[PDB]
Every structure is written in structure tokens, then in C-alpha cells.
Amino acid sequence: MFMINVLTLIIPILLAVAFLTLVERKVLGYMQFRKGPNVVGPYGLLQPIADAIKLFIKEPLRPATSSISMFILAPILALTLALTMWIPLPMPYPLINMNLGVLFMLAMSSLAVYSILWSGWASNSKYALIGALRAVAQTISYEVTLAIILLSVLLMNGSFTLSTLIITQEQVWLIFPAWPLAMMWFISTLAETNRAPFDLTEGESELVSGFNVEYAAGPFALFFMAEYANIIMMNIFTTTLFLGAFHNPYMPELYTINFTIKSLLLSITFLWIRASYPRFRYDQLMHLLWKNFLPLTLALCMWHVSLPILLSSIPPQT
Amino acid sequence: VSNLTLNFGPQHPAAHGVLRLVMELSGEMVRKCDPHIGLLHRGTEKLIEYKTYLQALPYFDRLDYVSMMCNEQAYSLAVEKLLNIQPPPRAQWIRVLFGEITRLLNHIMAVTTHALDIGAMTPFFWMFEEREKMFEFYERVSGARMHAAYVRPGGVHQDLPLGLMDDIYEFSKNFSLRIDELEEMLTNNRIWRNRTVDIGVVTAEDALNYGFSGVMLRGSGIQWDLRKTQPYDVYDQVEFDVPIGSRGDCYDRYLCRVEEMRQSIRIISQCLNKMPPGEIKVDDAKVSPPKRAEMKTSMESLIHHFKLYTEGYQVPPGATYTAIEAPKGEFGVYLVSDGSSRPYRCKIKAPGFAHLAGLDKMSKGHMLADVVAIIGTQDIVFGEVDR
Amino acid sequence: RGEYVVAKLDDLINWARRSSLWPMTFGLACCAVEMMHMAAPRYDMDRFGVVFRASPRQSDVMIVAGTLTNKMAPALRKVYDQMPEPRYVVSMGSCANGGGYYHYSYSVVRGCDRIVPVDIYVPGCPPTAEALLYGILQLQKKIKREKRLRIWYRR
Amino acid sequence: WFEVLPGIAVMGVCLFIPGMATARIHRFSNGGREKRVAHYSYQWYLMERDRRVSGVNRYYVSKGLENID
Amino acid sequence: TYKYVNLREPSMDMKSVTDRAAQTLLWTELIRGLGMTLSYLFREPATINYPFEKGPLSPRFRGEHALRRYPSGEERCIACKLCEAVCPAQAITIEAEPRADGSRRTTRYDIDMTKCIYCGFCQEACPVDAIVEGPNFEFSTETHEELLYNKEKLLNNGDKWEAEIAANIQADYLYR
Amino acid sequence: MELLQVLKRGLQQVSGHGGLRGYLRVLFRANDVRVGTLVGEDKYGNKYYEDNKQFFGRHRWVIYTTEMNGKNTFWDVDGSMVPPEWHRWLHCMTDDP
Amino acid sequence: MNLMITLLTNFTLATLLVTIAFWLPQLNVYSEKTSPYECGFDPMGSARLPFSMKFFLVAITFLLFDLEIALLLPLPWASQTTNLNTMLTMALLLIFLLAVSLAYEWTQKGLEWTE
Amino acid sequence: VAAFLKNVWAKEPVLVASFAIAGLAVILPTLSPYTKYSLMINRATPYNYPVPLRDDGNMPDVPSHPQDPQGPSLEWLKRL
Numbered sequence A: 001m002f003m004i005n006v007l008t009l010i011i012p013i014l015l016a017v018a019f020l021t022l023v024e025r026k027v028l029g030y031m032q033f034r035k036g037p038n039v040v041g042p043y044g045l046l047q048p049i050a051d052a053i054k055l056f057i058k059e060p061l062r063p064a065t066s067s068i069s070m071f072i073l074a075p076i077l078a079l080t081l082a083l084t085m086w087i088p089l090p091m092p093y094p095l096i097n098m099n100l101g102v103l104f105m106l107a108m109s110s111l112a113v114y115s116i117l118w119s120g121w122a123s124n125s126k127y128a129l130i131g132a133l134r135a136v137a138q139t140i141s142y143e144v145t146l147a148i149i150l151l152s153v154l155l156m157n158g159s160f161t162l163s164t165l166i167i168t169q170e171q172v173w174l175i176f177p178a179w180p181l182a183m184m185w186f187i188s189t190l191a192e193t194n195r196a197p198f199d200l201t202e203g204e205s206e207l208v209s210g211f212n213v214e215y216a217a218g219p220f221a222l223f224f225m226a227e228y229a230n231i232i233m234m235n236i237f238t239t240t241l242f243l244g245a246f247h248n249p250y251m252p253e254l255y256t257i258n259f260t261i262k263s264l265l266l267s268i269t270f271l272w273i274r275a276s277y278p279r280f281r282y283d284q285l286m287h288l289l290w291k292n293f294l295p296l297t298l299a300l301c302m303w304h305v306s307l308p309i310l311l312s313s314i315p316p317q318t
Numbered sequence B: 001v002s003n004l005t006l007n008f009g010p011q012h013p014a015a016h017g018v019l020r021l022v023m024e025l026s027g028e029m030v031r032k033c034d035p036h037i038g039l040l041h042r043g044t045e046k047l048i049e050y051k052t053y054l055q056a057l058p059y060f061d062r063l064d065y066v067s068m069m070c071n072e073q074a075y076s077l078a079v080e081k082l083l084n085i086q087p088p089p090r091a092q093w094i095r096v097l098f099g100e101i102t103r104l105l106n107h108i109m110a111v112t113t114h115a116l117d118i119g120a121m122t123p124f125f126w127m128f129e130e131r132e133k134m135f136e137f138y139e140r141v142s143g144a145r146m147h148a149a150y151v152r153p154g155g156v157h158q159d160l161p162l163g164l165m166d167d168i169y170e171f172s173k174n175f176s177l178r179i180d181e182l183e184e185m186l187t188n189n190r191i192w193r194n195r196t197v198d199i200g201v202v203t204a205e206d207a208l209n210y211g212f213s214g215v216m217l218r219g220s221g222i223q224w225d226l227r228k229t230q231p232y233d234v235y236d237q238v239e240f241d242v243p244i245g246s247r248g249d250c251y252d253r254y255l256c257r258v259e260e261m262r263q264s265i266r267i268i269s270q271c272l273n274k275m276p277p278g279e280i281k282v283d284d285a286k287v288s289p290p291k292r293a294e295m296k297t298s299m300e301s302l303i304h305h306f307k308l309y310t311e312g313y314q315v316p317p318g319a320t321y322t323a324i325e326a327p328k329g330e331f332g333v334y335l336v337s338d339g340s341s342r343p344y345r346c347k348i349k350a351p352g353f354a355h356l357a358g359l360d361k362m363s364k365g366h367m368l369a370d371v372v373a374i375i376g377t378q379d380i381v382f383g384e385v386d387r
Numbered sequence C: 001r002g003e004y005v006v007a008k009l010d011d012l013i014n015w016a017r018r019s020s021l022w023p024m025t026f027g028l029a030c031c032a033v034e035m036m037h038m039a040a041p042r043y044d045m046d047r048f049g050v051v052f053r054a055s056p057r058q059s060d061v062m063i064v065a066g067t068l069t070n071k072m073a074p075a076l077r078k079v080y081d082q083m084p085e086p087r088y089v090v091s092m093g094s095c096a097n098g099g100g101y102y103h104y105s106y107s108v109v110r111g112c113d114r115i116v117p118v119d120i121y122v123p124g125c126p127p128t129a130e131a132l133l134y135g136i137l138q139l140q141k142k143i144k145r146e147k148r149l150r151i152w153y154r155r
Numbered sequence D: 001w002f003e004v005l006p007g008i009a010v011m012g013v014c015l016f017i018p019g020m021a022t023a024r025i026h027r028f029s030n031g032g033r034e035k036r037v038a039h040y041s042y043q044w045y046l047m048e049r050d051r052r053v054s055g056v057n058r059y060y061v062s063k064g065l066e067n068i069d
Numbered sequence E: 001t002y003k004y005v006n007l008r009e010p011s012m013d014m015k016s017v018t019d020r021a022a023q024t025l026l027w028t029e030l031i032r033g034l035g036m037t038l039s040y041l042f043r044e045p046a047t048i049n050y051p052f053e054k055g056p057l058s059p060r061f062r063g064e065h066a067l068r069r070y071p072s073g074e075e076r077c078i079a080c081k082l083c084e085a086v087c088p089a090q091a092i093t094i095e096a097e098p099r100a101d102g103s104r105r106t107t108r109y110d111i112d113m114t115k116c117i118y119c120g121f122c123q124e125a126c127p128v129d130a131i132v133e134g135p136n137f138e139f140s141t142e143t144h145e146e147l148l149y150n151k152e153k154l155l156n157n158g159d160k161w162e163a164e165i166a167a168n169i170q171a172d173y174l175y176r
Numbered sequence F: 001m002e003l004l005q006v007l008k009r010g011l012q013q014v015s016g017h018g019g020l021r022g023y024l025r026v027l028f029r030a031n032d033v034r035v036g037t038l039v040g041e042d043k044y045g046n047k048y049y050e051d052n053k054q055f056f057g058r059h060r061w062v063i064y065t066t067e068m069n070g071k072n073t074f075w076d077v078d079g080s081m082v083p084p085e086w087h088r089w090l091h092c093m094t095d096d097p
Numbered sequence G: 001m002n003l004m005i006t007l008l009t010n011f012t013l014a015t016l017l018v019t020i021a022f023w024l025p026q027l028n029v030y031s032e033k034t035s036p037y038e039c040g041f042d043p044m045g046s047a048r049l050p051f052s053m054k055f056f057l058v059a060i061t062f063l064l065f066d067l068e069i070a071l072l073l074p075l076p077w078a079s080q081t082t083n084l085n086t087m088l089t090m091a092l093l094l095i096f097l098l099a100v101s102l103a104y105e106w107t108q109k110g111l112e113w114t115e
Numbered sequence H: 001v002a003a004f005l006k007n008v009w010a011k012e013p014v015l016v017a018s019f020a021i022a023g024l025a026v027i028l029p030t031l032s033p034y035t036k037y038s039l040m041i042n043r044a045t046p047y048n049y050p051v052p053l054r055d056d057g058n059m060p061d062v063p064s065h066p067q068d069p070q071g072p073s074l075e076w077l078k079r080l
């Protein structure tokens, strides 16, 4: 019964990754004024299976790793984190209801970078090293800021439960009480994934994803997996945190529907932002975070420490 | 010790041509860059010496492939100039028309691919659709897609198919709308701007010593043009105005390319209004072949045909340097003719071969991630640079 | 009888593996622009599943377009030489397919055969994007008849 | 133009399945009604009290007012 | 004349800088302008299914090298060597032995489609219009062998379609 | 209000074109499913369709069918399946079939 | 225990998928091995490295700013007590102190990133 | 002052607005009328069982029966 629950959670996020990649290719296609894949199956529904079994079957391809340990560690870690992140996300019901919750997601999201340190470490290519160190740097710098945001927007919940969030949302979406901090936290969600503008790239550039996206073949179908699945997550955790629907018990699938729709549309907006804008150069990015985001986050935060005591509504910890 | 030596990369997804590069740098900053050019070098100038003028012309097509009818115009103007001929007026007008059309091509490419390199996957797509419409024009005109000559000495041959200028008009109608759509796609984008603002500036006199000729001099002070100052054909007459910029900032150069696209629309328009119905080729039978109706049934037309193909017209000896305005800047060929059929020694001038030599100074003040934009910003094709 | 399983699975790994086949674009010279017009919206590649992505390690097959000079050639064979073992080479353009408009002078290599083995020769100068596309499709139809596994079954 | 919306629909089924799954599996495996939430020790204590007074060892059957009769 | 850009006075006066703090801060131009001009998505994309549909072309288009012959086919080629003489890639070969009838045709007429740049010069130079660039682009041979054409392959190419080429030539001969 | 016209366009084309199985047939055959447009002078096995002129560039379209040269089968569709004259009129070369 | 079963599964499927992804490519129909791989000469990608203080300092400030962040993390529990005065005083005081660290480092030569 | 703030708000609006949110966030908790309400609320929620005391020999107040009003009354929260 319980392993049934686990399987029903984790298999559909993988299928969700495949057909997500489909929707990505299409939305970018028409956004670019051209039809996406039609010629694999009808309408493009066989495209993932192509990508899937082929991209699995192309042979391992290079080089001496120098560490047999890490090379087969990092993918397992990246997946395992990407799969367990989905546990607390509320849904009508969490599948594990944790008192703390959201800071558990915050915590594992903080662990997610060892796959980049180790992945980029075992290349034996001294350039992919440097690239990896840098990607760790930007991911980590946006692990600073984001944490403070959750530590603010949550302060209108009154507890970490991640369930009571759906209780706060009943009257008004949390986007209204703070829009700006929600804006900064959206862009923050673009950060770690390194969607455009924040992505690094091919041609001439730091090429972190040059060997990172190149190397490890099938295990690149893994890093591929954890990256897209992690995307769908951060979209969902946005949908839960900064907005949400009314939960009518006796009919949970109603809230499940509405939740699903808004989340999917949000991810759609990721893929079309990536279409939309150019990339920042690296330093302008890092100290764009240090220049402006983090100070204004501090301001809004202290204003949310002082605010609820002003208006005399401070939230009811259960 | 410190520093480094890094290298190029084989392609970005749109890459036109490959360079290597060696940049001695400091921590995420480039102190010295030394581009290795000559990677793709096909040895044209040695080939041209072995082939007659009519034969060597596709070389002048495809040495710089993006802008094409322009290079055609350069070599043709060279042979005409040295050969004491004038093309009939309608030839000059058609040549102007497709000249500025081609300029619209090379500019829209340079801008869009400059975006795709930097980010911004989409504008490449939106605009290269219209570019496909442009080649849809060429295919009617010359009977092939891209490299088809459709330019000779002593004027163009095979005038437009009946009903072409309608299509030309129709594209030129709303191209303005679409390029403005690009201007909303960019230009006040905090990303693209804030990536390229002060990167790779140039002092005017410095640009003169380094010999930059093109959107470089345009966008940085030093108001100059060959189109205005040394009109090489009826392109003199039509009215239009060139842009400039005062920041020398590499952003000015962008906007100058844009405004040159718009002005190109003006020139195309007025050209469509002014077109005389004179004729195509010159009337001198020994410079350019006769049409088949005269070829057959008439003796001298046949002879001049046969020999003008086998041996080709003979060009009197002389040394010429012609220069035109090509969308990458001043382009020119230096012809050296023994009195003969074949040429002898002709060295083209690639604007990219000059502009590229400037990365040493231009890139001295910005780290490599924007050395990308430093290379891409000045319109350059490594097929033209090498030669 | 398992040979039915053999042929079916052949059409599976083959069916997919050909259905995607996203290559790398080597793009030396003016054939590269025409290739980009195959990537433009009108002639668009994506419909057929071919994806545009650049890296020799991710590369399914390689398109040699443009003129191949002596100076570039070794680098070309290296790019060939770190690649997924199943691989295919499509020679685009009159130049790379046997020397094209040069075929002479010195710096240019004559054909890309002299460097790496080649599968689909598509002539044209440049080959019209439609023609290049027809070349890729014909490469797919070379992938159909591979029948690679049942000879590993040695019957 | 419609090419993407079937794929989006499939994403909708694909993200929408675990919600109905876990919800119906509470409403089945856990008895007619939802699973209790034990976050605070008090609520757990009440749970195991229900457990002991069920005679079924399960907090599903809640007994009822008439169980005292 | 010179019409220059970016030389302007940014107003540090009020009501400009209002919208400057709004502009830097709230991303309105970025959001509205860009996101919306992509939300321009809905226009029907331009894509064509190549097996089942084909893009536009022109009667002067240059395909592959079909030889032509007269009505009551004479092998319209006279052997006169011109098409070989003007070939800018030099790739052609002609060797002509007078045949039984005393008229002259070619023994070996060859092309390297590899070397061939698809000029159109050999289409202009032929006095009798023996060789014409075909309409059809039909290609993608599997071997470097197969791209070299005998006189024979060029003939059979000419027989495969003529009234095609007859329609093109009959259309455009007024231009040439 | 307006969408009923749209679903009547799709419903119409799928209804009249190919029948019950015909929509699946033409659909997997060519992922482009178009309203039945005129006739197009069948000639060999391959059937032609010329649109009402609704739009350019995708003006006209074809199904290659099967058995050409007593060789291959369907699913092998490619160029050169068109005979010469249909190659001319299908490419916009000439506006007269 | 329940979430520990979820961790046992989620670690399996990771392991299983990895294993499949190693088998099948070297379980493939024909695997062929020739090419030399030159670790060899220092300038292939980059050369050597003179690791620079900037990135490391970013790791550092990531530490100090973490510490202040987690020290701030329990606040949502503390925002409700019977002493509000002290609460506001030392919460605004604490994260104000974070912003003082940042303001200092932003005044000195630190960051500035072009060097 | 006026020119200084106009210029720092011309250049760096994020930083000015940040100091504004900061300062206003500092002062406003002192002035606003609603402050005491929050405190009295927070004190009105018992976490811990109220424990009786020996009644006889005491000053009468906070009376036995929970309805007898003499104790504290949060009714002001009942309607607010």
C-alpha cells in the first residue's frame, strides 16, 4: 500500500520529465514561429521515447575518470535528491506530513550541489573543474538569498507545516500580501536551474555545461533528469507558496486540478523566458545578486518581522 | 606566474566560420588576446591568376558569401573601370537595388547571429524567415539560391522575370513593421544592453590608424562614407541619410546597423520608383556576349560569342584599386592586368581582415565572456578574412 | 523462435535512434548559412526530430559543410574521433564532397574522405536546404536497413 | 498552432495522477476519512487513545456515542 | 546625411526619473514589451513538410546537368568543347571521334558533380543548348564514385525529363 | 460562439476526408492533415492536392501512396516520387497543372 | 520509518537506473575501443590554474551569511511570545547586523569583480 | 539633501527603496495604534492548563464558575 504511494509519486514525475521536454521543444518552437516535432509519432508524443532509449543506447564514450567512486556517486545523488524533494509538497495530502517541511526542502536543495562539485571534479579536465567551481558559486549565492525569502514569506503562515500554507491561502493568494518578494523569489528559482538569462553556454563561454552536458552519456540523461524534474518542482513549490486554490474536502481532485494547471503554466513561463532574453555575463550576474537582490531582501524581511506586530495580526502557530 | 592559455571553441550552433584564439589572461580577465586567423584559407588569389575574368568572378562572389551582390559589384566595377566601359542605366539601377537588398541581408544576419551567439534564441528565427523570403527573390532573379552571379563586367545580364518587382515591393512594404518588432525585441532590454554598453570602445583617430572602415567609423564619430563621398554608380542620385553615434560604445554600432537597414528600405523604395526600362548589358558585342536570337542567324554575334567564351575579352594593362561600401564596410579589389585575357594578380581587401586585427586593442579592457560580443559585434566572416 | 524478437527490437532501437538523430553542425563555410536555413522556420529541421545542439560528445552524426583546408583537417578528425561509437558522416556541399570549386591549389583537402569516412554526399553549391534535408532523410533510410543486430545473432 | 496543447494535456494527466492517487489511498487504506496529523505530541496521544479504545487496534473505527450505551 | 542616435539628453528632471526608478525597479518595459511580443506566438508558424510539400522555385533554377537532344534525337551536343572551355572548376571532359555517319559527337563527356559549382556558364555557352541545368535536384549518392557522370548517365538524365526542361527553356529563352 | 466554427472546421475535415480510419491513416502517413482540396489529376498511384489558394508556401501537397516501380512500399516516402511534370507544377515553377 | 522506506526506494531507482545506463551501452551490439586519450599537455582546455581569491571569498561570505541566516531561521517560532519589544529589537537588530556586514564588505575593495 | 536624495534615487533606486523599507520598518512599529492588540492577543492564548487554587480565605475575584464574570474578559476580541 505504501510502496504503491511511492511508485505513484516518483514514476509520474519521470514521465512528467519526458513529456515536459516535449512541451519545451514545442513551446520554444512556436514561440520561434516554427512548428515543433511532428514527425516522430503523431503530433510529437513519441519524441521522448526516441530521446529516451536512444540517448540511453549511445555508448559510454570517454575518458579515464581517475575516481570510480565519485563518477558513479554524483548521478545517484542528483537523482535521489530530485526524487525525494517531491515528498513534502502538499498536494491535497503530503504523502509524508512533516512538521518542519519547507526548510527540509530548503535543506536538501542546499545539498544538491555536491553533484556539481563531484561531477565537475572527476572530469580530470582542469577546465571543467573551474567551470564546475563557478557554477557551484552561483548556485550557492542564490542559496543564500532564497533561504531568506522563504524565511520571510513564511512568516505570514506562522509555522513551517507547509500544510497550513494552504490554510493561509484560503481568503487571498499570498502573492498579494507580498508581490515583490515573490518576484525576487521567482527569479531566484530561475537561478539554480540556470535557465536563461542565467544559463552558461556553448560557442565561446565558460562551458561548464560543455563537459557537464557532454560527459557521462546516459548519466547525462540523469543530470538531464534531475535538472528538469527539479524545474517542475520549483514551479510547483512556487504554485504552493505564492498562490493556490481552495481545498474542498470530499473532492480533493478539484484542488489537485487547479494546482496542476497553475503549476504547468508557470513552467511554461520558464521555458518561455529562456526563449525571450539574452544571458548575463558571469560577474554582472553574481554581483548583480550581491548588488541589489540581497539588500532589498533584507529590507523586505525586516519589514515582515516588524509588520505583523504592527497590524496586530501575527499568525497562529498551531 | 599566474595567467593561462585558453583556446577557441569549434562552433556555436549558428557558427559561420572557425577561428582559433589564444588569450593570455588574468583571473577572468584577458590581458592579451592573439587571434589565429588563416584557419580556413582556400587560396583564391592564386586560382584567379589561372582563370579568365568571366571565370574568376564566382570567386568574388563567394570570398565573402553573406554579402554577395555587393562583392559582385566590386569586382565588376573594377573590370569596367579598368576596361573603359559604362553599363547602361537600367543595369546600374538593378545593381543598386540588389546591392542594398544584399546589405539588408548581411545586416539582418550580423544582428541576429550576434543575438544567438549571446543568448536570445528566437530573433534569429523570426528574422531569418524573412531572409528566406530574400533568397526567394534571388532564386527568381539569377536562377539559383545564393552564390549565383547575376553580375558581369559591362553590366548585369538576364534582367528580372516579369512580375518580380511586385514581390520586391510587397516584401519592402512590411519589412519596416518586422524590423521594428525586432526593435521591441531588443533596445531597452536591460539584459542585452547591460551586457554591451561600454565594451570595446574605440578612439576615432585610433580607428583610422588601425584602418577600420565600416559601421566602426560610422558608430564612432569621424563621419565618413564611400556611398556619399565617392559615388561609384547611379547610387549617387537616390536620397537617404547615414547614421552615426557619439559613444563609440559598440551599442552605437548596433543601432547604426539597424538604421542602415531602415535607410536601405528607403533606397529600395526610391529605386523601385525610378527604374528606367533601358536594357540589361552594355551594347558592345566584344565585351559581353550577345543574346541568343542575335547569336544565331548573325555571324559576328556568333564569333564574339564563341571567342568571348573560349578566350574571353582582353583587358588593357593597368593597375586599379576600386572600393565600394559593403555591409561589412569598405570592400575592394586591386586588379593587375597584363594585357591579356586572364588577370594577373588581384588581392581583395577583407574588412574583417582589418577589423579582426583590432581585437588586440579593443578587447584589452574586458573579460572573455564579453570578448564573445567583442568579436561578434564588428561584422566579420572568417571566410572573407582569409582568402 | 526469438528471431521475431530480434527483428522487432531492431526496429525499436533503430526506429527511435533514427527518429531522433540530432547531429552537430561543423559549418566551415558558406554551406553553413544554407544549413542554418534548414534550421530556419520554413524548412525547419525540428519537425523531423533532428535537434540542433553543439558538442562532439553529444553528437549523433556529423555534417561536414564548408571547405576543408589542410590546417583545419586534423582538428576535424579529432572531432570525429571523440564521438559515440555508432556514428555517421554526411558530406554537405561541393567543396567537402570531393573538392568543389577549388579541388586545386594546396591548402584545401580534396574531399572529406581523405580524412574521415563518409555516408551521404549531397551536392549543390550550396545544396538547397531542401536538398540537404533530402540527404538527411536518405541517411535515415540508410539507418532503416542497418539490420545490425541479427548478424550479431550470426544468422 | 495547437501542437503543444496535447503535450500540455499529457503533462496535466501526468502531474495530476499522484494527487488523486494519494488522496484516494488515504480515503481507502485509512478508513473512510483522512489520515490524522500527529505533528504535536498531544494529537498523537489522542490517536493512540482512539487506538486502545477501538478494540480493533485501529483509529479508523472511532466507536461512537452509543459505545457506552 | 548624418542622422545620429544615442546622442540625447536623459532627463534627470522629475517625472522622467520617476519612470526610471519604476523602469529599473519594476521591469515593466522588459515584461510588457518582450513577454508580450513573444506572446505574439499565436501567429501560424511558417513550416513546410518536405516529403509532402515543397518550397517555391523559379524557371531559371539550376539542377543537375541533363543533356538534351533534338526531336528525333540527334544527341544535340556537337562536341564543340565550349562547355568544357568555360568551366570555372575545369570539371568536364570531352573527347570527340567522328562517328559512322560522319557527323561529330562526343565519345566521353564527363562531369564531376563534386567539382561542379553549378555556375550556369555551361548553360549559357552551349550554342545549341545541348546541356541545361535541370529543374530537379535529385541527389544524395552513397559513394564518391556515383557523383561522376558519363555521357551515358547525362543522356539518361535527359531522357528522364525533357518536356520539363522544354517548358523551362520555352519559358525563359526570351530572356536569353 | 466563434469556436463552434473552429470545431466545425476540424470536424468537417476529419469527417469528409478519409472517413473513420482515413484520419488515422493520413495522420500517421503525413503528420499534416489538411482539408480535402479539389482532386489533382491522380496519374500514378500518388495523389495530388491543390489548396483553394488559402495560403502560400504549403500551397499544394501530395501523398505518394505505394508500389511505385513495383518496388519498395509505403512508409518509404521521399522526393523523386513525383514524376517530372508534377515536379514542375508542385514547386511553384508554373501555375498550370 | 515511512520516509526511510521512501529514501530506500528513491535510492534504489537511482541505483537501478544508473546500472541500466552502464550495462546497455557496453551491453550494446558492438563496442569498439581504439582512440588514444591524451591527458598530456597542459594547454588543452585552459592551462594550469592560478586559483583566484574572489571565488573562495564568495564561499567564505556564503558561510558568514549562512550562519547569520540560520541564526535568523527560528524567528517564525519566536515572533509570538509575551515580550514583543525585545523581539522586534533584536530581530531588527540581528538582520540589521547582517546588513552591516554586507555594507562594510561592499564599502571596502571587496567584490567589484573586475580585476 | 533634496538634490542628494534625488541623485541617489536617480542612480540606485533599489538601494534607496531598501533604506526606505528599512527605516519605515524601524519607526512604524512604535507609532501604530494596533501594537498593544497583538500583545494582548498573544497573551490570551493559553498553552497550559489553568490550575485552581484554594478558594476559602482569599480575596474574591476570578470566580469559580467559568460564566461568573469577575475574571478577565477577551470579549473585546469576540467583537473587533
Ligand SMILES: CCCCCCCCCCCCCCCCCC(=O)OC[C@H](COP(=O)(O)OCCN)OC(=O)CCCCCCCCCCCCCCCCC
Pocket: A077, A080, A081, A097, A098, A099, A100, A101, A104, A111, D038, D039, D040, G001, G003, G004, G007
Ligand atoms: C558514501 C555515501 C553514502 C550515503 C549516500 C546517501 C545519498 C543520499 C543523500 C541525501 C539524502 C538525505 C536524506 C536526509 C533525510 C532527513 C529526514 C528528516 O530530517 O526528516 C525530518 C522529519 C521531522 O519530523 P517531524 O515533522 O518533526 O515530526 C513528524 C511527526 N512528529 O524527521 C522524521 O520524521 C524522522 C525521520 C528519521 C529517520 C532516520 C533518518 C536517517 C538519515 C540517514 C542519512 C544517511 C545519508 C547521509 C547523507 C549523505 C550525503 C552525501
Ligand SMILES: CCCCCCCCCCCCCCCCCC(=O)OC[C@H](COP(=O)(O)OCCN)OC(=O)CCCCCCCCCCCCCCCCC
Pocket: A180, A182, A183, A184, A186, A187, A197, A238, A242, A273, A277, A288, A291, A292, A293, A296, B190, B194, E024, E025, E026, E027, E031, H012, H014, H017, H021
Ligand atoms: C506602505 C508600506 C510600505 C510598503 C513598501 C513597498 C515597497 C515596494 C518597492 C518596490 C519593491 C521591489 C520591486 C522589485 C525589486 C526586485 C529587485 C530589483 O529591483 O531588481 C532590479 C535590478 C536592476 O538591475 P541593474 O540596473 O543592473 O542593477 C542596479 C545596480 N546598481 O535587476 C534587474 O532589473 C534585472 C533582473 C532581470 C531578471 C531576469 C528577467 C526576469 C523576467 C521575468 C520577471 C517577472 C516574473 C514575475 C513572477 C512570475 C510568477 C511568480
Ligand code: SF4
Pocket: B062, B147, C029, C030, C031, C032, C065, C066, C067, C092, C093, C094, C095, C096, C100, C101, C124, C125, C126, C127
Ligand atoms: S560548396 Fe559552394 S556554397 Fe558550399 S562551402 Fe563550397 S563554395 Fe561555399
Ligand code: SF4
Pocket: E083, E086, E087, E088, E089, E090, E091, E092, E111, E115, E116, E117, E118, E119, E120, E121, E122, E123
Ligand atoms: S555549372 Fe558545373 S559543369 Fe557548368 S561550368 Fe560551372 S562548374 Fe562547370
Ligand code: SF4
Pocket: E076, E077, E078, E079, E080, E081, E082, E083, E084, E094, E125, E126, E127, E128, E129, E130, E131
Ligand atoms: S557547348 Fe554544347 S554542343 Fe558544344 S561541346 Fe558543350 S554540350 Fe556539346
